[PDB]
Each structure stands twice: as structure tokens, then as C-alpha cells.
Design a protein around this ligand. Structure first.
Ligand SMILES: *[C@@H]1O[C@H](CO)[C@@H](O[C@@H]2O[C@H](CO)[C@@H](O[C@@H]3O[C@H](CO[C@H]4O[C@H](CO)[C@@H](O)[C@H](O)[C@@H]4O)[C@@H](O)[C@H](O[C@H]4O[C@H](CO)[C@@H](O)[C@H](O)[C@@H]4O)[C@@H]3O)[C@H](O)[C@H]2NC(C)=O)[C@H](O)[C@H]1NC(C)=O
Ligand SMILES: *[C@@H]1O[C@H](CO[C@@H]2O[C@@H](C)[C@@H](O)[C@@H](O)[C@@H]2O)[C@@H](O[C@@H]2O[C@H](CO)[C@@H](O[C@@H]3O[C@H](CO)[C@@H](O)[C@H](O)[C@@H]3O)[C@H](O)[C@H]2NC(C)=O)[C@H](O)[C@H]1NC(C)=O
Ligand SMILES: *[C@@H]1O[C@H](CO)[C@@H](O[C@@H]2O[C@H](CO)[C@@H](O[C@@H]3O[C@H](CO)[C@@H](O)[C@H](O)[C@@H]3O)[C@H](O)[C@H]2NC(C)=O)[C@H](O)[C@H]1NC(C)=O
Ligand SMILES: *[C@@H]1O[C@H](CO)[C@@H](O[C@@H]2O[C@H](CO)[C@@H](O[C@@H]3O[C@H](CO)[C@@H](O)[C@H](O)[C@@H]3O)[C@H](O)[C@H]2NC(C)=O)[C@H](O)[C@H]1NC(C)=O
Ligand SMILES: Nc1nc(=O)c2nc(CNc3ccc(C(=O)N[C@@H](CCC(=O)O)C(=O)O)cc3)cnc2[nH]1
Ligand SMILES: *[C@@H]1O[C@H](CO)[C@@H](O[C@@H]2O[C@H](CO)[C@@H](O)[C@H](O)[C@H]2NC(C)=O)[C@H](O)[C@H]1NC(C)=O
Ligand SMILES: *[C@@H]1O[C@H](CO)[C@@H](O[C@@H]2O[C@H](CO)[C@@H](O)[C@H](O)[C@H]2NC(C)=O)[C@H](O)[C@H]1NC(C)=O
Ligand SMILES: *[C@@H]1O[C@H](CO)[C@@H](O[C@@H]2O[C@H](CO)[C@@H](O)[C@H](O)[C@H]2NC(C)=O)[C@H](O)[C@H]1NC(C)=O
Ligand SMILES: *[C@@H]1O[C@H](CO)[C@@H](O[C@@H]2O[C@H](CO)[C@@H](O)[C@H](O)[C@H]2NC(C)=O)[C@H](O)[C@H]1NC(C)=O
Ligand SMILES: *[C@@H]1O[C@H](CO)[C@@H](O[C@@H]2O[C@H](CO)[C@@H](O)[C@H](O)[C@H]2NC(C)=O)[C@H](O)[C@H]1NC(C)=O
Ligand SMILES: CCCCC/C=C/C/C=C/CCCCCCCC(=O)O
Ligand SMILES: CCCCC/C=C/C/C=C/CCCCCCCC(=O)O
Ligand SMILES: *[C@@H]1O[C@H](CO)[C@@H](O)[C@H](O)[C@H]1NC(C)=O
Ligand SMILES: [Zn+2]
Ligand SMILES: [Zn+2]
Ligand SMILES: [Zn+2]
Lengths: 195, 291, 49, 65, 98, 47
């Protein structure tokens, strides 16, 4: 566990989150870099690892405490409560991360809103994203057979402006003091035009 | 030869954004992508008065009777008298800073006039296009040119709007200039259409090609023309018993050898001339036999 | 000496094969130029192919 | 403007930024791309192939990245 | 890949005869030949409203970014509605006598 | 007309003297020398 260098727990799989946009700037109050301007593509997992969101809207910072528009802002962190949200597979909270994200920004003029269902498991998997004229393309290894490492196309997003930047959204799990689980790290490899 | 057509049922493609509202300027063109839907092309084309069309590696008639994997359309307001500036290889400002047509896929260029009775489309005040887009440098102006099918880098600056001829907007390193002139008479528009053909099923088909003439059971022993999910050809289907969730089987040399049909049977696919034939001929008796 | 002449004939044949291979790169074969760079510089993608 | 749900109300939870605890030497677990297992390879769109070797020019990661 | 460009300095090509005075008839067309000079093609093209262009073994965009040994231009007054009579292979009097 | 020798008729947009060949010796570069274009590698030679 990163927070406590002594305790050791079995490793669990966790999904990442990203923000992709066309222009970047500063968070005006704190002068912290990493603010996406105009229409921004956001990919957010939710539902205790059973759902993933995808929307393309303008992020309007909120001036409340510890939010993007305040002077006490440090980072955009999405959280969830396993005790309440992930109590059981029947009462999974599908909007916990989305509700956490809405506290940082007001969502304005969103072009679309998509979601995809993910079967809960512990197998390793791969995720990819590209873009061409048709739009933004998503790839996954859970499409055909999760026990093979090949990635297959499963979605196309209507984003046509050229994407130049992306930023990983950090996650922090508010687990109780009993569990205090450990989360698997993920790795990002850049694609290149190759034979 | 008989016929054999199998097509899935899909919803209608949404062309309402193009048929309602005010078309955008050329530098801020609107793009629509259609997958897994059907369209009534006759209805769409009737709404417009076409002045010219130019297609590459495809024909307009074929676009009304064939299936594709994807359909992309870019449209914007454009005066017909500036048609030459949209032609491939033009040296004008339209190609440099507004729109460059891409030729990596089969495509068509259509110019048309909006009739008066088509009141759902609203006329803009003026036609507009950019004259230059550059970055200030020590040597001079560092012009930025549009990639094929892409947007101009000065798009954000151009969003501020132009109220007079040769009005310039700058935000520091970037500077752009625009040109406007009033719209007279009926509105005129442009349409850049591109299509892609996939080796798998093609889910974008016109309504005129939507049919289920899957009478293959009665046409087993006959050379027929088949059109199965966008795959066309000629062959003979033989009853056969037989990798993944795919309806088509191909050999190493990319020949279609097997098909899975809607009825539930599996058919072997062979060309209409497949059985070898040899003739034994005797010159003395003028007799012949077949093997 | 005919036998001595055949040695020079073999040498000339070896030279001729490389001469044929090298000379074919300077032909335009009906194109506007024998250089790909010239074709790309003088023509646009619809007509370059 | 599609419906994005109920607007958020309240205060954002504070977060502590300590990059030293995350990018230390003890928490370094390198994993390179293994081309023998075809890791990070996107399957070509449309059609499948079986028992064949083909050459493709597209977007792929570098070996041992 | 890097870049390597070397070009000599020359004077400006004189296009003033074409931009001043009255253009001649088609049968008495004016010819200009330019060697060892540079031209500002953007300025020239801006002065005119182009209705049509047809090029052979070259593109207009390439003519604005490439060097040549010689440049020849023939110009005359001509109505646009008679464009078909200037097309290759025409059977009209324009090709035969003008 | 295109000549195999130097082409002395050039547009003003193509008038440049980016002759930084000394720093680009050991690299494949695109060259445009007096109307002659191509790709290649330049090696220091005496002649
Ligand atoms: C996965 O993604 C899908 C698609 O984006 C989401 O489905 C949408 O869910 C939202 C709620 O989050 C729905 O919005 C609500 O729709 C009600 C009825 O809408 C009618 O009209 C629309 C437009 O034609 C149709 O799509 C729809 O079928 C109906 O005919 C409204 O009554 C609601 O308004 C009320 O709630 C909002 C809450 O924000 C208030 O602001 C309003 O004042 C009012 O009280 C609301 O707009 C939306 O219609 C759904 N779309 C579709 C296509 O189904 C899924 O929710 C999402 N799944 C997740 C995140 O788990
Ligand atoms: C983490 O662990 C889970 C659970 O698997 C169990 O615990 C492991 C520690 C091992 O001891 C496993 O043997 C044990 O079952 C792993 O998920 C499981 O992966 C295996 C790997 O083969 C799956 O087996 C497959 O199961 C299907 C069932 O139809 C067959 O078709 C296949 O031939 C094959 O046998 C197993 O089903 C799967 N279980 C679940 C519930 O998903 C997981 O892979 C592992 N993760 C990592 C990264 O090691
Ligand atoms: C593609 O769109 C066109 C135009 O919308 C469709 O054609 C139209 O079809 C309707 C319904 O069949 C016709 O309406 C009928 O018209 C007659 C005219 O006498 C009338 O008696 C009936 O009561 C009825 O209203 C309509 O005329 C016809 N229009 C034209 C111009 O042909 C067409 O069907 C669509 N194609 C597909 C494949 O859906
Ligand atoms: C080719 O010809 C064109 C047109 O003559 C040249 O562009 C023009 O360049 C001049 C001098 O740089 C510009 O004048 C300046 O304009 C600004 C406008 O705000 C003004 O602030 C300055 O005081 C000055 O007058 C002029 O605007 C510009 N015109 C256009 C239409 O771009 C061009 O430089 C020539 N090219 C070459 C390579 O010589
Ligand atoms: N918190 C935590 N997260 C991790 O991802 C983690 N990973 C390791 C080791 N990770 C790995 C992963 C794969 C292979 C491998 O050989 N395949 C080796 C070590 C050790 N402690 C951790 N601790
Ligand atoms: C974003 O903030 C950074 C600092 O966090 C700004 O960089 C400063 O720029 C000013 C003005 O030139 C300099 O005086 C400072 O020294 C810079 N600070 C640092 C730490 O380098 C940056 O300009 C801001 N960007 C925008 C677009 O506002
Ligand atoms: C994208 O966001 C930027 C920054 O928020 C917007 O740029 C502003 O635009 C207004 C209106 O034209 C200008 O008056 C401001 O000076 C600009 N601000 C900055 C910091 O550049 C821009 O308008 C947005 N893009 C679009 C298409 O609305
Ligand atoms: C979101 O879209 C709305 C509706 O298109 C925009 O609201 C318009 O804003 C303009 C510019 O300020 C006003 O002149 C219009 O009157 C507004 N229209 C309506 C119907 O309210 C709005 O600007 C967009 N929000 C952004 C870009 O942040
Ligand atoms: C042609 O017939 C096939 C087979 O009946 C149709 O496929 C069915 O489509 C319906 C909806 O219309 C689905 O509920 C069924 O599950 C489909 N069956 C199978 C086996 O896939 C197909 O839609 C028809 N195509 C037409 C009428 O254009
Ligand atoms: C590029 O640089 C060369 C080398 O300096 C220039 O050639 C010189 O041109 C001047 C006049 O501008 C003559 O007086 C010199 O004799 C030339 N030198 C040589 C070695 O020939 C050339 O003009 C420059 N080209 C540009 C600036 O376009
Ligand atoms: C009407 C202009 C007359 C030009 C007279 C002399 C020109 C010297 C060289 C010109 C290069 C060819 C430009 C062709 C432009 C066609 C229209 C376009 O593609 O934009
Ligand atoms: C409008 C004329 C109609 C002619 C009707 C019958 C013609 C018999 C044969 C004609 C030869 C072809 C002439 C084509 C001329 C094209 C215009 C031009 O290149 O000048
Ligand atoms: C941010 O930078 C501005 C200058 O642009 C400065 O006035 C302000 O105090 C800075 N804010 C913080 C929190 O450092
Ligand atoms: Zn896609
Ligand atoms: Zn048979
Ligand atoms: Zn060398």
C-alpha cells in the first residue's frame, strides 16, 4: 500500500481515467497547469469496475472549496466509497465517480454521452485509443476473448478536431481502515507508425 | 443466372442536422459520419438542384445501390462561381487555408443550390472564407496550411467573427484574416462525400438495396449473382457442413469458399466453372468421350 | 584465338548484366519524370498515383 | 446539450499531493513490450486471418519499450 | 529528415505590360517570356477572379512553389461563354484561325 | 520548361537560403538546389 510502506495486501485491478483535449492552460486561481479549454473528451470508469463513461463537454470550474475554481485546489481526484457504492453486485452505484467529477467542474454544452458495460473479473486486459478522420476509436481486449491479449475495436466517438494533449485523472479509494487494499499499477505505451 | 440477396435490418441515418439550421462557413465545416444505418438517397437528392459533381474511384449511381462500412459527409456554404478554387491542385486561398479535399478513399464533390421552397434551411448573412493564417517569425510570415480533411489552425481565432472585408484577428503568435460578401439569391452549398469498403459486412446500405431475396434453397444447383452484406460476386452454392462469429470463410488466397446464411445452413461457394473437363478424341473414327 | 575470345565474351556478359540493371533506373517509362521526387513536387495526390 | 444528470452541490474533498511516495525506487516494477507475445498489438479491422504471416504498416508500439 | 535549400538572388519579373493598357484580340495575342527572375504569384492571382483552369502535366499549386528554366505566358481578351471553343480538339473557328 | 541545369525562374515564396549543410552532414535530408530536388546524404569530399 503506497500510503503505508509497512503493510502488504493482495493486489487488485483498477481502471484509469483520462482527459483529452485540443488546447491547455492554467488553473487561474492557483496558476497550476493542466486545465483543458473548450470541448474536452473525458473517459471515466464507474460502477465499481462495471461501467465506463465517455462524454465531450466544456469543463467549467466551480469556486467551492478544494475545487478547480478555488485557491485551495491541488488536483482533480475522483473517489468512491466501497462500503456504500460497492456493497454488493446488486446495488452497485453507477454514478459515484461521475458525481465526484461533477463537483470539480460544471458540464456545459455536451455533444454526446456514452457508456459501456464491463463484466467484473480479475484478468489482465489492454486498452487502446487512436484518431483519424472518422473520429476517435477505442480498442479493448475484452471484446472477443479476454484470455487473449489482442485488442479489438468496439466504439467510435464523434470527435473530429485533432487531439493534441491527454492527462491521467488520479483516483483515490476511500476504503475503510479494515480492508486497506492495494491497487495494480497500469502502464502506457505510445503508438508509432511502424512496419 | 438467379439472384441471392441477404441484408440485415437497421435504423434510418439521421440527416436532420444538414437539413435544418444555417450551414456553417467553409473554414468551420460540419462533418457527419454514418455507420450501421440505411438512407433514402432519392429523397435527399430531390431537395437540391445539383450544378456539378466530380467523383474519384466511384460513381454517383453506384452510391445509390451499394453498401459500405462507413459514410462521411462534409458540408458548408459555398458560392458556385468559386468552383474552380475547390478543384484538386488549386493554388488559391481556399485550398491553403479553408478546406483541402482528401483522396485516400473514394470520394465525390457536389455543388448544389437550395430551392426557395426548402424553408428549413436558413440563409446566412454573408459568405466567408479565410485569406491567410500565419505565425510571426523573424524572417517574416510563417504560413500554416491545411492538411487534407483537417481544420485550419486559425479556427479559434476565426470564431470571433468577421464584420468587414479584410478584418484581422490576432492572439499573439497567431494571426488570421477573413473575407466576406453578401449572399444574393438562393443559397448555394457544397458536399464532400467519402466512403469506405470493408471486407467484412457493410452495414451502410441504401433503402433501394434493402431486400431479403434469400431463396437459396431453390437456387442451389444454378450459377447465381449473390449480394451478401455488401459482398458481391458470382458462384454456385453447395450444401456443406461446418472459426469465429463470422458468416464468411476465406482461403489463404482470399477466395470466398464458405458462407453462413440466415436459414441456418452452411454452403460451399465455388465459381460457376469449377469442375475440370477433358476430352478424349480419336481422329480416325471421329469419335470423342468425356472425362 | 577463338578459345581466348570466349573468356572475354564471358567477362563482357558479366558486365552487360549489371549495365542492363543500372541503366533501367533512368527511364521514365512514359511518365513526366524518372524521379519520384519530381513527380511529388510537380503534381498533386489525385494525379501522382 | 445532452442531459448530463443532476448538477453537483457541496464542497470538493481535499487531496494531498506527495509525488515522492509514488515515484520512488522501491515502487519501480518495469514491464517492457514483448513482441513474442504480440503485446499491445491492435487487431486489423474487418476481416480475420488464420495460419498465415502478413506484413502490416500501421500504429504499433516499439519492441522492448 | 532535415532540409537543405540553396537559391541565387535575381531581380523581379516584369509583369507590367500585362497589367497596364488594353489586352489585344485573340488573333493578335501578346507573348511574354521570363528567364532569370523571381515573381510574386500571390499578388498576380489576387488581381483576377478565376473562373476555370486546366493544366497538363503540372498543377497550379506546383507552379507557385517550383523553379523552371523558362516561363512563357500568352494572354488576350476573350469572353468566358466561348470557353468550349478553346478546348483541345475543338472544331470551331477559334482553333483553326485564332 | 524544366532544365537539368539550374532553374533560374523561381517564385518569391521559394526564395530561401537554408544552406545549413555543415550541421546536417550525417543525416538523410531533402535538398532543393537551384531547382534540383531529391533525397540523399552529403559526405565531405574533395574535387
Ligand atoms: C448511458 O448513456 C445514456 C445515453 O446518454 C443515458 O441515458 C440518458 O439518461 C439521462 C439521465 O441521465 C436521460 O435524461 C432524462 O430524460 C428524461 C426523458 O427524456 C426524453 O427525451 C429524451 C430526448 O429525446 C429521450 O432520449 C428520452 O428517451 C425521453 O424520451 C427527462 O425526463 C429527464 O429530465 C429530468 O431529469 C433531469 C436530470 O438532469 C433534469 O434536469 C430535468 O429537469 C428533469 O427533471 C432527463 O433529461 C436521457 O434521456 C437518457 N437518454 C437515453 C437516450 O436513454 C444513461 O443514463 C447512461 N447510463 C448511465 C450513466 O448509467
Ligand atoms: C487472478 O485470479 C483469477 C482467479 O483464478 C483463480 O485464482 C488464481 C490465483 C489461480 O489459481 C487460478 O487458477 C484460479 O482459478 C484468475 O481468473 C481465472 O483465470 C483462469 C486462467 O486460465 C481462467 O481459466 C479459464 O477459464 C475458462 C472458463 O470457461 C476456460 O474456458 C479456460 O480454458 C480457462 O481455464 C478462469 O476462468 C478465471 N476465472 C475467473 C473467475 O475469471 C485471473 O486470471 C488471475 N489474474 C491474473 C492477472 O493472474
Ligand atoms: C424515399 O422518399 C420518397 C419521398 O419522401 C418516398 O416516396 C414517397 O412515398 C410516399 C409513400 O409511399 C408517397 O405518398 C403517396 O403518394 C401518392 C401520390 O398520388 C398518394 O396517392 C398517396 O396517398 C401517398 O401520399 C409519395 O408520393 C412518394 N413521393 C415520391 C416523390 O415518389 C419514397 O417511398 C422513399 N423511399 C423509400 C425506399 O422509403
Ligand atoms: C506579394 O504581394 C503581396 C501583396 O502586395 C504582399 O503582401 C503585402 O505585404 C505588405 C508588406 O509586408 C503588407 O503591408 C503591410 O500591411 C499591414 C496590414 O495591417 C500594415 O499594418 C503595414 O503597415 C503594411 O502596410 C500588405 O498588407 C500585404 N498584403 C497582403 C494582401 O497580404 C507580399 O508580401 C508579397 N510577397 C512577397 C514574397 O514579396
Ligand atoms: N501496490 C502495488 N502495485 C503493483 O502493481 C505492484 N506490482 C508488483 C510487481 N509487479 C509485477 C508485475 C508483473 C511482473 C511480471 O513478471 N509479469 C512482475 C512484477 C509488486 N508490488 C506492487 N504493489
Ligand atoms: C501558467 O503559470 C506559469 C507559472 O506557474 C506561468 O509561467 C510564468 O510566466 C511568467 C510570465 O512570463 C514568468 O514571469 C514566470 O517566471 C513563469 N513562472 C514559471 C514557474 O516558469 C505561465 O506563463 C502561465 N501560463 C499561462 C498561459 O498563463
Ligand atoms: C476556447 O476557450 C478560449 C479560452 O477560454 C476562448 O478564447 C477566448 O475567446 C473570447 C471570445 O472570442 C476572447 O475574447 C478571449 O480573449 C479568449 N480568451 C483567451 C484566454 O484566449 C475561445 O473562445 C474558446 N473557443 C470557442 C470556439 O469558443
Ligand atoms: C452553449 O450553447 C449555447 C446555445 O447555443 C450558447 O448560448 C448562446 O451564447 C451566445 C454567445 O454568448 C449568445 O449570444 C446566445 O444568445 C446564446 N444562446 C442561447 C440560446 O442561450 C452558449 O454560448 C454555449 N456555452 C458556452 C460556449 O460556454
Ligand atoms: C432478412 O431476414 C433475416 C432473417 O429473418 C432478418 O434478421 C432478423 O431480423 C430481426 C429484426 O427484423 C431480428 O429480430 C432477428 O433476430 C434477425 N434474425 C437473424 C437470424 O439474425 C433480417 O432483418 C431481414 N432483413 C431485411 C428484412 O432487410
Ligand atoms: C544565398 O547565399 C549566396 C552565398 O552568399 C548568395 O550568393 C551571393 O549573392 C550576392 C548578391 O546577393 C553576390 O554578390 C555574391 O557574389 C553571391 N555569392 C556567390 C558565392 O555566388 C545568394 O544570393 C543567396 N541567395 C538568396 C539570399 O536568395
Ligand atoms: C488569371 C491569372 C493570370 C496569370 C498570368 C501569369 C502567370 C504566371 C504564372 C502563373 C502560375 C499559374 C497560375 C494558375 C492559377 C489557376 C487558378 C487557381 O488554381 O487558383
Ligand atoms: C450543336 C451542333 C449539333 C450537331 C448535330 C449533328 C452533327 C453531325 C456531326 C457533327 C460532328 C460533331 C461536332 C461537335 C462540335 C462540338 C463543338 C466544337 O468543338 O466546336
Ligand atoms: C498567479 O500569477 C499571477 C500573475 O499572472 C499572480 O498575480 C498571482 O499572485 C499568482 N497566484 C498564485 C496563487 O501564485
Ligand atoms: Zn472507430
Ligand atoms: Zn454441388
Ligand atoms: Zn559519409
Amino acid at each position: 500500500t503506497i500510503i503505508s510502506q509497512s503493510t502488504n495486501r493482495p493486489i487488485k485491478k483498477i481502471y484509469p481515467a483520462f482527459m483529452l483535449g485540443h488546447s491547455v492552460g492554467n488553473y487561474t486561481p492557483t496558476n497550476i497547469t493542466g486545465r483543458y479549454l473548450n470541448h474536452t473528451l473525458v473517459i471515466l470508469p464507474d460502477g465499481c469496475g462495471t461501467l465506463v463513461h465517455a462524454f465531450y463537454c466544456i469543463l467549467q470550474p466551480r469556486t467551492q472549496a478544494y475545487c478547480a475554481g478555488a485557491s485551495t485546489f491541488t488536483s482533480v481526484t475522483v473517489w468512491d466509497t466501497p462500503a456504500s457504492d460497492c456493497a454488493n453486485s446488486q446495488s452497485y452505484n453507477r454514478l459515484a465517480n461521475l458525481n465526484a467529477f461533477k463537483l470539480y467542474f460544471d458540464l456545459i454544452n455536451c455533444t454526446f454521452r456514452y457508456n459501456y458495460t464491463i463484466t467484473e473479473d480479475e484478468n489482465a486486459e489492454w486498452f487502446g485509443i487512436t484518431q483519424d478522420t472518422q473520429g476517435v476509436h477505442l480498442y479493448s481486449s475484452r471484446k472477443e476473448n479476454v484470455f487473449r491479449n489482442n485488442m479489438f475495436h468496439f466504439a467510435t466517438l464523434p470527435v473530429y478536431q485533432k487531439i493534441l494533449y491527454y492527462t491521467v485523472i488520479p483516483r483515490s479509494i476511500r476504503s475503510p481502515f479494515n480492508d486497506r487494499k492495494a491497487w495494480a499499477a497500469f502502464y502506457i505505451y505510445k503508438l508509432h507508425p511502424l512496419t | 443466372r438467379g439472384e441471392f440477396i441477404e441484408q440485415a435490418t437497421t435504423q434510418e441515418c439521421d440527416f436532420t442536422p444538414m437539413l435544418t439550421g444555417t450551414p456553417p462557413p467553409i473554414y468551420n465545416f460540419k462533418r457527419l459520419v454514418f455507420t450501421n444505418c440505411n438512407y433514402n438517397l432519392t429523397k435527399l437528392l430531390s431537395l437540391f438542384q445539383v450544378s456539378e459533381f466530380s467523383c474519384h474511384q466511384v460513381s454517383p449511381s453506384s452510391l445509390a445501390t451499394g453498401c459500405y462500412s462507413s459514410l462521411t459527409v462534409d458540408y458548408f456554404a459555398y458560392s458556385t462561381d468559386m468552383s474552380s478554387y475547390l478543384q484538386p491542385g488549386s493554388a488559391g486561398e481556399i485550398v491553403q487555408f479553408n478546406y483541402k479535399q482528401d483522396f485516400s478513399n473514394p470520394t465525390c464533390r457536389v455543388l448544389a443550390t437550395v430551392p426557395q421552397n426548402l424553408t428549413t434551411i436558413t440563409k446566412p448573412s454573408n459568405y466567408a472564407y479565410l485569406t491567410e493564417c500565419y505565425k510571426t517569425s523573424a524572417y517574416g510570415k510563417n504560413y500554416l496550411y491545411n492538411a487534407p480533411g483537417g481544420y485550419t489552425p486559425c479556427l479559434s481565432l476565426a470564431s470571433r467573427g468577421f464584420s468587414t472585408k479584410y478584418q484581422s484577428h490576432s492572439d499573439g503568435e497567431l494571426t488570421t484574416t477573413g473575407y466576406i460578401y453578401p449572399v444574393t439569391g438562393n443559397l448555394q452549398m457544397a458536399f464532400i462525400i467519402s466512403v469506405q469498403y470493408g471486407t467484412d459486412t457493410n452495414s451502410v446500405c441504401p433503402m433501394q438495396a434493402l431486400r431479403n431475396d434469400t431463396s437459396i434453397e431453390d437456387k442451389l444447383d444454378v450459377c447465381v449473382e449473390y449480394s451478401l452484406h455488401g459482398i458481391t460476386g458470382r458462384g454456385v452454392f453447395h450444401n456443406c457442413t461446418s472459426l469465429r462469429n463470422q458468416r464468411f470463410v476465406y482461403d489463404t488466397f482470399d477466395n470466398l469458399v464458405g458462407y453462413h446464411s440466415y436459414n441456418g445452413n452452411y454452403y460451399c461457394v465455388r465459381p460457376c466453372v469449377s469442375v475440370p473437363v477433358s476430352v478424349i478424341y480419336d481422329k480416325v473414327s471421329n469419335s470423342h468421350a468425356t472425362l | 584465338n577463338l578459345a581466348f575470345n570466349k573468356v572475354q565474351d564471358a567477362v563482357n556478359a558479366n558486365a552487360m548484366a549489371l549495365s542492363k540493371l543500372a541503366a533501367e533506373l533512368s527511364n521514365t517509362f512514359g511518365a513526366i519524370s524518372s524521379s519520384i521526387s519530381d513527380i511529388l513536387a510537380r503534381l498533386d495526390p489525385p494525379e501522382q498515383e | 446539450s445532452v442531459d448530463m444528470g443532476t448538477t453537483g452541490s457541496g464542497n470538493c474533498i481535499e487531496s494531498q499531493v506527495q509525488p515522492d511516495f509514488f515515484e520512488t525506487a522501491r515502487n519501480t516494477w518495469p514491464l517492457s513490450i514483448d513482441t513474442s507475445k504480440a503485446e499491445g498489438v491492435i487487431y486489423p479491422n474487418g476481416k480475420s486471418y488464420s495460419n498465415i504471416t502478413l506484413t502490416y504498416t500501421g500504429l504499433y508500439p516499439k519492441a522492448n519499450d
